[PDB]
Design a protein around this ligand. Structure first.
Ligand SMILES: NC(=O)c1ccc[n+]([C@@H]2O[C@H](COP(=O)([O-])OP(=O)(O)OC[C@H]3O[C@@H](n4cnc5c(N)ncnc54)[C@H](O)[C@@H]3O)[C@@H](O)[C@H]2O)c1
Ligand SMILES: NC(=O)c1ccc[n+]([C@@H]2O[C@H](COP(=O)([O-])OP(=O)(O)OC[C@H]3O[C@@H](n4cnc5c(N)ncnc54)[C@H](O)[C@@H]3O)[C@@H](O)[C@H]2O)c1
Ligand SMILES: O=C(O)C(=O)Cc1ccccc1
Ligand SMILES: O=C(O)C(=O)Cc1ccccc1
Ligand SMILES: [K+]
Ligand code: NA
Ligand code: NA
Lengths: 347, 350
């Protein structure tokens, strides 16, 4: 919206336009209070620049909260590259220039922003960025980075889901129906984990093959148009953000929402409805923090893989703390998580 | 619109919004090719944020060329602070908060951008910025800065005016009529300079005190409504930019345009029109370069005051080169200036 695009209260917005590629670049540094801003690079198509600006600020603010609540010494930032065509349709040469320009932008911030992967960007892209700027996390193991953080994120989301299920009074995942929306790197692993835990998995993905494979594995497909109306115990959004609008919140037929997506909730009203409806939501910025713990933990703190897994597991404990505040103060899980974030950040 | 404002070819745009003060902040880095981007901080009210962005881009682009054509090893950048109220109304606390925020923004650029004064910002403000960030030119003398660059700018503009009048075949300033729009820091000195060289001055300013003072000095006041319709030999815009629109270029009644104002020409056609009508224009980015020569010369290059003075005087020579290319190649002075800028920059890199 105009407000989220222009009247954003974060510390800094960096924009650039490259006529040659037709790509627009946005970097939003929400906060550098706890340290340099850090957050991945999302590359996607947007209807209007306003949307790209809006998303960057929402994602950046989520990163600040995520580092805060996760006890990681970094601020929150995010880059959004507004593509002139579908990612898949971008030619190699064009993509390469795009990354080059993005790296130059990051470089000007001289360490006030550290990037990483996000939607449509990967370790190879991080490496390419690294060919021009030092401020990049998530480079391939071969190039010196921590590599993929997908599994770590999956672990964090899974533990989040277990803690939530337990708090909601459902006991364990065993015998629960979990609807995973998005069978990507993280969602795929999450499904595997929950299935191993005894849950029955309902899955949805825009990629046919992905779905058929899941089915091949014993899972059950859910048509796209049926996703939001399909009864389940847990709804696990692991695709795009903004899924839970007020209307969605009013009609979701589950008892827990716990997934990997960023900015899952469309507005505060949605969050209240869920609460009111007895649907326990595990706040995104808490639940999906595994990625950040992996990259920051490994690359900044020198933590081993085992340690980062351990810390990702502790996301369950953080959520238990979130739930306690929610229950005690009678506020939504999101509010409670913001409160915890502030307390941990020593605000 | 914002969308159109954002379709800018510069290297980087920095923006920020401070809800508490209601101020908007823009930093535009046009180029860092020749060195870190550098340019002043303009603080004013804008109708739309988009206008602030557009202004910043045009100002930043002029800085690129200015440094290049002036042989200064720096890129071009500019800051624009979109005020939530008339600058005068801004209480000291709010102003102080605005500057601190601006300083933080500059600071994140970590030296890829060096600021300085511009409209509504002064050496005191530079000192304040410097409380927070290192990348500031124009600090007070006490603070380690070179202070005001206004006189140096005036000297350069004056020399520019002389060169242009001469090139235009009008001879010397003595006896010529010069219209000085804006009797500010620069305009005031310029008026003094020209008057000393024998010019008859017509003056205008929104500050009535300023006008009276000039009249007291023997100058002739011009009503604001009349400024662009007043016949003169030389038109010296030393207030706001964009004065010379296409429409104004068609009717301007003077032989030379040479002032201190930034981005004097509103649209390209205006430039073409002045050229076609035989009104010799000394490009702003060349003519007003005394400010930059002073700041960069003093604070970066190690130049003495005398040398700075010499360099500013040399603006007339640069203009002579500009007009020379304009005449040979048949292009406008602005185009010839850009050409010269590009030559120098190469040479400067070669
Ligand atoms: O890493 P990571 O795992 O977060 O991301 P990812 O990019 O690896 O996974 C994104 C996934 O979500 C799917 N997706 C996109 N839009 C969808 C929609 N409307 N419904 C369901 N799935 C959709 C994609 O096909 C893909 O599997
Ligand atoms: N590149 C730079 O750093 C830079 C820095 C400062 C000034 N400048 C430029 O040069 C111009 C002169 O700067 P200055 O230091 O002398 O500024 P200044 O504020 O000291 O003086 C500007 C003068 O113009 C007057 N004015 C405003 N609107 C007017 C109008 N419509 N008609 C007549 N007078 C009007 C103001 O009242 C003031 O007396 C600036 O406005 C800007 O374009 C450039
Ligand atoms: O975890 C995320 O959502 C990201 O944005 C990836 C990331 C995390 C931490 C630092 C840099 C990038
Ligand atoms: O005189 C100018 O062009 C300025 O904008 C003031 C300034 C000059 C050089 C560097 C920074 C600011
Ligand atoms: K159960
Ligand atoms: Na703020
Ligand atoms: Na099954």
């Amino acid at each position: 919206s105009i407000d989220s695009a222009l009247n954003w209260d974060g510390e800094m917005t960096v924009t650039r336009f490259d006529k040659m590629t037709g790509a627009h670049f946005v970097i939003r540094l929400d906060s550098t209070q706890l340290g340099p801003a850090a957050g991945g690079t999302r590359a996607a198509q947007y209807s209007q620049l306003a949307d790209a600006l809006t998303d960057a600020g929402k994602l950046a603010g989520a990163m600040t909260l995520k580092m805060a609540v996760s006890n990681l010494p970094m601020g929150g930032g995010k880059s959004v590259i507004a593509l002139p065509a579908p990612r898949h349709s971008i030619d190699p040469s064009t993509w390469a220039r795009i990354l080059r320009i993005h790296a130059e932008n990051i470089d000007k911030l001289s360490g006030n922003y550290w990037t990483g992967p996000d939607v449509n960007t990967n370790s190879a892209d991080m490496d390419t960025l690294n060919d021009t700027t030092e401020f990049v996390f998530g480079r391939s193991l071969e190039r010196g980075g921590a590599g993929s953080s997908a599994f770590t994120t999956a672990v964090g989301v899974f533990e989040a889901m277990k803690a939530t299920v337990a708090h909601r009074g459902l006991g364990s995942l065993d015998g629960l129906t979990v609807l995973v929306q998005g069978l990507g790197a993280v969602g795929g692993s999450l499904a595997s984990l929950a299935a191993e835990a005894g849950a029955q998995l309902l899955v949805a993905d825009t990629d046919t093959e992905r779905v058929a494979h899941a089915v091949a594995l014993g899972h059950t497909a859910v048509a796209l148009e049926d996703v939001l109306s399909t009864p389940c115990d847990v709804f696990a959004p692991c695709a795009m953000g903004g899924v839970i609008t007020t209307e969605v919140a009013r009609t979701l037929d589950c008892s827990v929402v716990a997934g990997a997506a960023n900015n899952v909730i469309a507005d505060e009203a949605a969050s209240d409805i869920l609460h009111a409806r007895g649907i326990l939501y595990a706040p995104d910025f808490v639940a999906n923090a595994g990625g950040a713990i992996h990259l920051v933990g490994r690359e900044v703190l020198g933590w081993s893989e085992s340690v980062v897994h351990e810390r990702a597991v502790a996301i369950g404990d953080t959520l238990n703390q979130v739930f306690e505040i929610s229950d005690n103060d009678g506020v939504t899980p999101d509010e409670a998580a913001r409160t915890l974030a502030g307390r941990r950040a020593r605000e």
